[PDB]
Ligand binder design. Structure first.
Ligand code: CA
Ligand code: CA
Length: 275
């Protein structure tokens, strides 16, 4: 009784899955509130915690990190859900606490950890209204090192004529991901701005929750892991590809939805991006 969430089908991942491309050996770091490693539908390979109060990265006191991890790599088996890249080595980088909040030094420390342990893909379903020199330096350093960095655009909606995309998604080096529903329409809470790159399903997204549960969440945080998992599926087919050609492939083969200020280049199509 394994259910494939609409989001995985929408981005066309199951087409790569049937060819033998499931993201094997690609290392994906889920910089978030930790991942519940005791979940029978998740296989966490490693990680580290930078939350001074929550030293176990494999204990998710919020539920956010486990949900995001499931969209990325919920195992292909007989139970629960199926991720975008079922065979990726999942890394729990806990930078957010039980309350869902985290300080920048902790997040930046986690980004540094991912660079030094050679994460092929960094996923940041988090953000804030302000950036620092150090947050820009960490994300640019990861990209200069060959890491594909993906982050949620934010859940700020519209604000007149300006950008509501948060950081680190706002930085030119990070792929900013917005949210669409099942019918390909922008979700009202999705952040907008010239920084938006791609869209992925982020409305009523079913994924793994701590304590052998499954539940649906809505937000750009749920959109981001579809792209991070799509980058892993593309790297499993094309391991020689640099982070730049992966991002270039993902942005240039999207399905066009309205204006770029609201939809970026459009909905990702991992089947077309993987060639
Ligand atoms: Ca499963
Ligand atoms: Ca960006």
């Amino acid at each position: 009784a394994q259910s494939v969430p609409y989001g995985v089908s929408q981005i066309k991942a199951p087409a790569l899955h049937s060819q033998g491309y499931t993201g094997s050996n690609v290392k994906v770091a889920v910089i978030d509130s930790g991942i519940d490693s005791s979940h029978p539908d998740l296989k966490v390979a490693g990680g580290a915690s930078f939350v001074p109060s929550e030293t176990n990265p494999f204990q998710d006191n919020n539920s956010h990190g486990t949900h995001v991890a499931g969209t990325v790599a919920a195992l292909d088996n007989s139970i629960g859900v199926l991720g975008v890249a079922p065979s990726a080595s999942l890394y729990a980088v806990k930078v957010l606490g039980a309350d869902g909040s985290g300080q920048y030094s902790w997040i930046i420390n986690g980004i540094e950890w991912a660079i030094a342990n050679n994460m092929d893909v960094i996923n940041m379903s988090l953000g804030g209204p302000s950036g620092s020199a150090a947050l820009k330096a960490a994300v640019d350093k990861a990209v200069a090192s060959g890491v594909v960095v993906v982050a949620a655009a934010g859940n700020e909606g519209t604000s007149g004529s300006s950008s509501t995309v948060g950081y680190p998604a706002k930085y030119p080096s990070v792929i900013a991901v917005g949210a669409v529903d099942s019918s390909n329409q922008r979700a009202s809470f999705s952040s907008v701005g010239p920084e938006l790159d791609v869209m992925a399903p982020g409305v009523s997204i079913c994924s793994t929750l701590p304590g052998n549960k499954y539940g649906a969440y809505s937000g750009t945080s749920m959109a981001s892991p579809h792209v991070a998992g799509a980058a892993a599926l593309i790297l499993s087919k094309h391991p020689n590809w640099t982070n730049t050609q992966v991002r270039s492939s993902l942005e240039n083969t999207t399905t066009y939805l309205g204006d770029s200020f609201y939809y970026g280049k459009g909905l990702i199509n991992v089947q077309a991006a993987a060639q």
